[PDB]
Amino acid sequence: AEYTLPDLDWDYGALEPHISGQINELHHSKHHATYVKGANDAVAKLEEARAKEDHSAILLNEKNLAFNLAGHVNHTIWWKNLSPNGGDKPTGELAAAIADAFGSFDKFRAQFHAAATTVQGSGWAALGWDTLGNKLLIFQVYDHQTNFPLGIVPLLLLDMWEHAFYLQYKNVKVDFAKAFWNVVNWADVQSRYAAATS
Amino acid sequence: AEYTLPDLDWDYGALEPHISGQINELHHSKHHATYVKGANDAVAKLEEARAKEDHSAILLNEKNLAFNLAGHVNHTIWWKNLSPNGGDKPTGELAAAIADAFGSFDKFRAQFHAAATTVQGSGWAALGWDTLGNKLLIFQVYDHQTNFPLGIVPLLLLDMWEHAFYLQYKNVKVDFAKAFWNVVNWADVQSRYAAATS
Amino acid sequence: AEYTLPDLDWDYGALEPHISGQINELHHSKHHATYVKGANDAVAKLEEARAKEDHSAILLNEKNLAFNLAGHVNHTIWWKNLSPNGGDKPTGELAAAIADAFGSFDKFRAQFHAAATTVQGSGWAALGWDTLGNKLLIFQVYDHQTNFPLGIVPLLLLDMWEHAFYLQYKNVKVDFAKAFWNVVNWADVQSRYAAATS
Amino acid sequence: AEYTLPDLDWDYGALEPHISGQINELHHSKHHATYVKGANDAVAKLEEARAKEDHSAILLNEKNLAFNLAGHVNHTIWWKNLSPNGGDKPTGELAAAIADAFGSFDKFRAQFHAAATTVQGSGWAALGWDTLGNKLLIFQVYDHQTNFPLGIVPLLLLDMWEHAFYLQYKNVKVDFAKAFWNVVNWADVQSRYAAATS
Ligand SMILES: [Fe+3]
Ligand SMILES: [Fe+3]
Ligand SMILES: [Fe+3]
Ligand SMILES: [Fe+3]
């Protein structure tokens, strides 16, 4: 249906001291809400274009759709990938899947950390499942909608946009990327992997 | 396992005169095979990097992975989306789904056509299924890996890279985009749509 | 010689309250300095590649060079486009050129503002001289190095990367885009325009 | 005034057999012409936008402006960089400048070639003059307006868009990149170089 702003499963300051409540608030109620509106409007402008049978602005409408919808999609998984009861390491299948796919959980951690801290502009680090080769792969996302193939199922995202850590970490993006591991909700990622493999 | 070049379901000149056998031979045996090799190589360079604990070239590795795997994925669906006993219009769920999401089939076709012919460089037009919103949406893909969100399930793709139409239609790509409709394998799209909703 | 981090022609807090001294400090000593080190590194990397006759990482070296040199080029102009004893309005040559190119300073200001506040990720708003058509145009720059032609002479830049106003304005980027006009150094732009027309 | 399609300084088939007369007519008369009209169209919509005080499509107008203006700029220099009486090596200042900046003319050829043949989608190889560092550098241009800094003076360009060699070289882009050195108009590049360092 219409896109909507999801409700957080924890209080804004439940991730402190890893992630400030101040950022979580602005991030959620300001930033994320902006993409949900942008996604809904994009879908509405396209409805109109088809009705009036005028696609002179197709490029703009398609960019707005992809940008906002991807913005919305990314943030939705981001809030679920975070937990106050998080951290530690993944267990079972997922733990086994990550070890076979990246050699070790530490090697996986390293690659994810490097993809997240070397983005040139806004972006993300993403762990996803490739349906084609049936493999767990890490992708370096540019902005919200670029640098990955179609049909990839996202499992774990790390928001590398400046607004995700600036207020707190300032320019030191690697301290924020290291902190992230302390609030990862592996139960949600395990659930995602199980759904992707089935 | 390794990414592999899928075999075609028809002889090279099965789609004539809409699509030349000459283009299909080169397209398949040269272009597509090059992406498969690149995808496998990218995955191999990442294995090496993790083994050496050296991610100085993570940006390059991640770009080579996304570019080639996306090229491989895009072309694997392309070949299945085409059929000499194709053309017509979709039927069943797909027909109703398309009609109930774009107004009509013709309104869908007009938008797809507009997205396919206004790309500013290499790209594709794509019919995808959004899992968060549960909507059928059209996206305008730049290159192979850009301008769309994560989790989108591709249903129907239209390759708008110059090599896909140049030998036959030269600079008149809108003529190639029109001919495309005569060879679409709706049985394949219907099949992908059923799996995406199930 | 190597690229260098230029000195500010004013104290870090000279722009308050329009732009905080804390942002100016970080911006200058941390961000800008990073691009200078990155362009020098890219340049050296290419020297070594040429000496070793090995261009296996040509894509990465060209990307690192473009991104960091453009980051360095944009910030260098940005520092010079600001002044504590500036803002308000341009005169003589450019004042006439701007009204002729955009109808009025106010119409010019509105499009500049619109270009600055609608970027989809990190970017800039830029006023440049097109040598080919001998026209004054405004460009919407993506990141540091994208969305503009070769040969464009930059005259006035507005940094829209989140790190440019986040600490102070938070998510309200239009309030920062508006406060920018109070510190523009018209003399510097006026000077860049005569040289471009020369 | 308006942007115009420049006339070629030679007959369409004057570059044979290095570059077909067929590709030259299509390239010039069809492709280049579209970029000229697209740039003039973009400039007009922006005039209209300013008149109606409506910048709701500013992202689209700025992208169409950049893409087409860049398309037009790149091809104008392309026609001038080619010559039937071309080839050989650069002499005088330029020769010494290249050797000084790249080690040798052959080390320059190798880098330029690699940059040209590794583009992931549409792009160009370009030799430019960096006004800031006063350095001669090679950039790997994506599409027509991406992957290079502002203020860069283009000297020599190599069109790597598929429509530039497909009809004749098919998928073998490296054979076309090699053939290129046979029609390079060093008299033009030397002239551009003198103007840039002036
Ligand atoms: Fe975010
Ligand atoms: Fe293709
Ligand atoms: Fe900045
Ligand atoms: Fe071209």
Side-chain angles (χ1 to χ4, degrees):
Chain A
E2 319 144 87
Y3 296 111
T4 56
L5 175 59
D7 281 311
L8 304 196
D9 290 327
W10 32 266
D11 182 71
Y12 284 146
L15 302 183
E16 298 230 357
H18 312 297
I19 302 175
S20 87
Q22 215 187 138
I23 281 168
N24 274 340
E25 181 160 65
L26 285 172
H27 208 183
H28 183 247
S29 66
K30 293 307 180 208
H31 289 289
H32 191 171
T34 281
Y35 298 123
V36 156
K37 157 105 147 93
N40 280 322
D41 286 352
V43 162
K45 270 267 159 209
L46 272 161
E47 284 216 30
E48 180 175 286
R50 281 190 304 263
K52 286 205 217 244
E53 269 302 272
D54 177 12
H55 287 299
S56 65
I58 187 66
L59 190 133
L60 179 57
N61 288 156
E62 292 285 359
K63 171 126 170 76
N64 274 349
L65 174 64
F67 178 69
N68 288 291
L69 178 46
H72 179 39
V73 162
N74 286 359
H75 295 105
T76 291
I77 297 166
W78 165 248
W79 301 129
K80 280 288 173 166
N81 278 173
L82 293 172
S83 172
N85 318 302
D88 296 40
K89 296 195 201 157
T91 55
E93 249 189 13
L94 186 63
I98 287 171
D100 280 289
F102 306 90
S104 68
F105 172 72
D106 281 335
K107 268 172 165 148
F108 156 73
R109 199 135 92 151
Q111 200 192 315
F112 198 85
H113 180 78
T117 64
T118 58
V119 172
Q120 299 182 331
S122 307
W124 314 61
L127 169 68
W129 171 257
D130 168 36
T131 59
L132 196 58
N134 284 131
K135 317 160 117 191
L136 272 183
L137 288 167
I138 283 164
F139 289 104
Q140 195 176 51
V141 182
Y142 300 173
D143 293 344
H144 289 316
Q145 76 283 17
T146 296
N147 215 37
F148 51 88
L150 278 149
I152 297 291
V153 181
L155 309 170
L156 186 67
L157 301 185
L158 176 46
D159 189 0
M160 298 297 295
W161 278 57
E162 293 186 314
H163 66 242
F165 60 82
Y166 223 94
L167 278 194
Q168 189 181 0
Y169 296 97
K170 275 56 129 153
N171 59 291
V172 193
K173 58 200 196 168
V174 312
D175 278 0
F176 169 61
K178 273 189 154 200
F180 167 72
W181 299 117
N182 294 305
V183 278
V184 161
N185 182 10
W186 290 111
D188 174 72
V189 172
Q190 256 156 202
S191 183
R192 276 169 193 297
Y193 175 78
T197 49
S198 296
Chain B
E2 261 213 345
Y3 286 113
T4 52
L5 183 58
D7 274 333
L8 287 197
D9 284 329
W10 22 267
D11 196 358
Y12 287 134
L15 309 181
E16 305 221 17
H18 309 295
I19 302 180
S20 87
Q22 192 197 174
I23 281 171
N24 283 344
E25 168 151 42
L26 278 174
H27 208 186
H28 181 246
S29 84
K30 307 289 175 197
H31 292 285
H32 192 173
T34 284
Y35 295 126
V36 168
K37 156 102 155 128
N40 277 330
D41 280 7
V43 162
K45 269 291 166 217
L46 278 163
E47 270 184 354
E48 185 168 273
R50 284 191 310 259
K52 298 211 172 254
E53 292 182 342
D54 190 1
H55 282 306
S56 45
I58 189 66
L59 194 142
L60 178 55
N61 283 161
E62 293 289 351
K63 207 190 187 305
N64 272 352
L65 174 68
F67 178 74
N68 291 294
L69 181 43
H72 179 36
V73 162
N74 285 4
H75 290 88
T76 289
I77 292 159
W78 168 248
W79 303 125
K80 280 291 191 210
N81 276 174
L82 298 171
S83 199
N85 306 317
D88 294 78
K89 304 178 132 226
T91 71
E93 258 187 326
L94 198 57
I98 284 176
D100 286 307
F102 294 104
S104 72
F105 175 78
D106 290 320
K107 271 162 168 195
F108 157 77
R109 202 145 82 151
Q111 191 195 326
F112 192 84
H113 177 84
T117 59
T118 53
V119 179
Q120 288 176 349
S122 304
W124 307 67
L127 174 62
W129 171 254
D130 169 45
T131 45
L132 189 59
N134 297 119
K135 310 177 94 83
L136 269 180
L137 297 162
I138 294 181
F139 289 100
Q140 188 180 48
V141 175
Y142 304 170
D143 298 337
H144 295 314
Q145 75 281 20
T146 299
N147 212 36
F148 55 84
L150 278 154
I152 291 285
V153 184
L155 299 183
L156 183 64
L157 286 167
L158 178 42
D159 191 7
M160 295 299 294
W161 279 56
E162 296 180 316
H163 67 240
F165 66 76
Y166 224 86
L167 277 172
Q168 187 174 355
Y169 297 87
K170 272 105 213 172
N171 67 285
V172 190
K173 65 192 183 169
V174 303
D175 261 6
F176 166 67
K178 172 156 161 209
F180 167 72
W181 303 108
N182 292 297
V183 284
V184 175
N185 189 8
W186 295 111
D188 179 74
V189 184
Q190 280 160 192
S191 179
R192 274 168 206 286
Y193 172 79
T197 55
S198 278
Chain C
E2 322 196 304
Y3 285 105
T4 48
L5 183 74
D7 284 323
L8 286 195
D9 271 344
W10 34 266
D11 161 272
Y12 285 145
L15 304 194
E16 319 222 66
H18 313 296
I19 299 178
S20 89
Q22 188 189 195
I23 284 175
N24 271 351
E25 185 164 22
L26 280 168
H27 205 190
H28 184 248
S29 72
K30 304 298 167 126
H31 297 272
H32 194 173
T34 293
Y35 300 122
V36 160
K37 156 93 203 279
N40 278 328
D41 276 16
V43 159
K45 270 287 146 181
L46 288 159
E47 285 185 345
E48 180 195 88
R50 276 186 313 253
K52 288 186 187 192
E53 308 204 36
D54 173 35
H55 285 294
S56 50
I58 190 64
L59 192 141
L60 177 63
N61 287 159
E62 297 287 4
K63 212 202 177 310
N64 279 351
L65 173 68
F67 180 71
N68 287 298
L69 179 52
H72 180 33
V73 158
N74 296 351
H75 289 95
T76 289
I77 288 161
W78 165 255
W79 297 134
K80 295 297 191 155
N81 283 174
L82 300 172
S83 188
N85 291 292
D88 310 83
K89 275 178 93 154
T91 62
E93 272 246 298
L94 200 19
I98 277 180
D100 284 51
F102 305 94
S104 69
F105 166 82
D106 295 295
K107 278 188 178 168
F108 149 72
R109 208 182 107 152
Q111 187 192 330
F112 197 80
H113 180 82
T117 64
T118 60
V119 187
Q120 300 182 334
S122 313
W124 304 72
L127 175 62
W129 173 254
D130 167 33
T131 57
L132 184 49
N134 295 127
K135 291 190 137 252
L136 257 184
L137 297 160
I138 284 185
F139 297 100
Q140 186 171 66
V141 182
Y142 298 176
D143 295 330
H144 287 322
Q145 77 286 4
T146 303
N147 209 46
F148 58 79
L150 278 152
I152 283 307
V153 179
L155 303 185
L156 178 63
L157 298 189
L158 177 41
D159 193 10
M160 297 302 296
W161 276 57
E162 292 185 318
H163 67 242
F165 61 79
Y166 220 89
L167 277 178
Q168 189 174 353
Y169 301 90
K170 277 113 112 265
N171 67 295
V172 202
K173 66 180 183 195
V174 304
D175 273 16
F176 162 66
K178 277 187 163 211
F180 160 71
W181 296 109
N182 300 320
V183 283
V184 162
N185 175 19
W186 287 114
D188 179 71
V189 181
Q190 270 149 199
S191 181
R192 273 169 206 293
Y193 175 72
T197 44
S198 289
Chain D
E2 304 191 89
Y3 284 109
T4 46
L5 183 63
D7 279 86
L8 297 192
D9 281 350
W10 25 264
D11 178 82
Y12 285 144
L15 304 199
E16 301 221 22
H18 303 297
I19 291 173
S20 82
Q22 203 172 181
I23 283 164
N24 279 335
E25 182 153 358
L26 276 166
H27 206 182
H28 181 252
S29 89
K30 305 287 191 189
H31 293 284
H32 195 167
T34 289
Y35 297 130
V36 163
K37 160 138 150 65
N40 279 333
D41 271 3
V43 166
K45 266 281 181 226
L46 279 167
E47 296 194 326
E48 174 171 273
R50 279 187 304 264
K52 293 220 277 254
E53 314 263 273
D54 176 31
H55 286 300
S56 60
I58 185 71
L59 182 136
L60 177 61
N61 292 150
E62 293 284 3
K63 189 168 202 321
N64 281 346
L65 170 65
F67 176 72
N68 284 307
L69 183 45
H72 178 31
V73 162
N74 294 358
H75 288 95
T76 295
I77 291 166
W78 167 251
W79 303 127
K80 283 289 174 160
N81 278 173
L82 303 169
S83 178
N85 316 306
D88 288 60
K89 283 184 198 215
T91 48
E93 270 205 295
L94 192 51
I98 282 184
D100 171 300
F102 299 95
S104 62
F105 177 65
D106 279 312
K107 272 170 184 322
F108 154 75
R109 210 145 90 151
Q111 194 190 329
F112 196 90
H113 181 74
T117 58
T118 52
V119 187
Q120 290 169 344
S122 304
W124 304 61
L127 176 61
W129 174 253
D130 163 43
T131 50
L132 184 57
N134 307 125
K135 282 203 206 188
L136 260 185
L137 298 157
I138 287 171
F139 297 103
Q140 193 178 51
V141 184
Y142 299 169
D143 299 334
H144 284 316
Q145 76 287 1
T146 300
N147 216 39
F148 58 86
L150 272 150
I152 294 298
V153 182
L155 299 179
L156 179 64
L157 295 169
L158 180 45
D159 193 357
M160 292 306 293
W161 274 55
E162 274 168 342
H163 68 233
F165 58 84
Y166 218 87
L167 266 193
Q168 175 180 2
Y169 295 93
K170 268 100 234 185
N171 67 291
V172 196
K173 62 184 188 178
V174 304
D175 269 356
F176 162 64
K178 273 186 159 212
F180 168 71
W181 297 110
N182 290 325
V183 285
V184 167
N185 195 6
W186 291 114
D188 183 60
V189 185
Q190 267 150 204
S191 182
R192 273 167 205 288
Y193 172 75
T197 52
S198 264

